[PDB]
Amino acid sequence: ARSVIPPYMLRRIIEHGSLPQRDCALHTLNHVKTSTGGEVIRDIYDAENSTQLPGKQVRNEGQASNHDVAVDEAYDYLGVTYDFFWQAFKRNSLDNQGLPLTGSVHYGKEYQNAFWNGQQMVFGDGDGEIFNRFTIAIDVVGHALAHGVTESEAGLIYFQQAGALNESLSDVFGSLVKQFHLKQTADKADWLIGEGLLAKGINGKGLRSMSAPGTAYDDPLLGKDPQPASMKDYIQTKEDNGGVHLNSGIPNRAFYLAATALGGYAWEKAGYIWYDTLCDKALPQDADFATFARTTVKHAEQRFDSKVAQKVQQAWHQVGVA
Ligand SMILES: [Zn+2]
Secondary structure, three states: OEEOOOHHHHHHHHHHOOHHHHHHHHHHHHOOOOOOOOOOOEEEEEOOOOOOOOOEEEEEOOOOOOOOHHHHHHHHHHHHHHHHHHHHHOOOOOOOOOOOEEEEEOOOOOOOOEEEOOOOEEEOOOOOOOEOOOOOOHHHHHHHHHHHHHHHOOOOOOOHHHHHHHHHHHHHHHHHHHHHHHOOOOOOOOOEEOOOOEOOOOOEOOOEEOOOOOOOEEEOOOEEOOOOOOHHHOOOOOHHHHHOOOOOHHHHHHHHHHHHHHOOOOHHHHHHHHHHHHOOOOOOOOOOHHHHHHHHHHHHHHHOOHHHHHHHHHHHHHOOOO
16 A cells, blocks of 8 residues: 555654643554546545444446545546546546546545555545645645556666655646646646645645655644755665655755756656656666656656757756756
8 A cells, every 4th residue: 555644754743742642643653447538437445433444335327426525536636637637638547447436435534645545545634733635735636646657667666766756656647637627737736645635734735845855744743844855865764665765855956947947837848758758668676767868868868859859858867866
């Protein structure tokens, strides 16, 4: 299971939070027909605050709203994610085989996470004091779904730089889904991961910033955003699967810089370049930052031209990936 809130963030809550705050985080941490191209198939379930999946079926494809905000958001944001991948890249669902998009809401009691489990999305309600409901932010929904895309293509392992790249691809595609939904060019996009997910009172903008890694939060409870912004400050650790959540800001910032330099809608050039790279049969499952970067420059040349390739190469250079 790929969960959006990392273990070190929950551990931080367990040590610094109030009794009820510690308790929900502890339970969260310790917990153990296909579509034809162009038309999504969704099925949304209600876990009714138990942890049995998928739960009770509440809204299948075309079914009217049951007026539960969580079900509405799951249904709508799974739809927008499908539409993005079809309109931008002519891809038919997460696996390019028309996989129906399944989601279960109200998982557990005050469950402080959301995750893709290899076959479906699962969403917690949050606690209302640190995190809001986990259907609330469209980019976070897209981020988690995007792990299914990566698994069906290059299949990058969840370890060190390959794992940081796996995380970064989810942030890239989650951001593009949001920008597509809001009709934003690169110069207008917020470039935040999880805007709206942090509860009122928490001192932060979101989980991460793609433009300025390390600046997203600074709160007595949650701690300080640990992400470095360049390779000079890359963290060498065996913790966090070798730093998959710590060091993803470096490739995230490379994408931000590339998209900024190219202008217009970020999915049309920079996005397509990253997509071509993920789908490249020569990209190894244990690829490092340097190998991934070189591959993006090749596809920039291939799909576009030398000027676009220059701008992509300079973005990687700026964040310290030679
Ligand atoms: Zn992820």
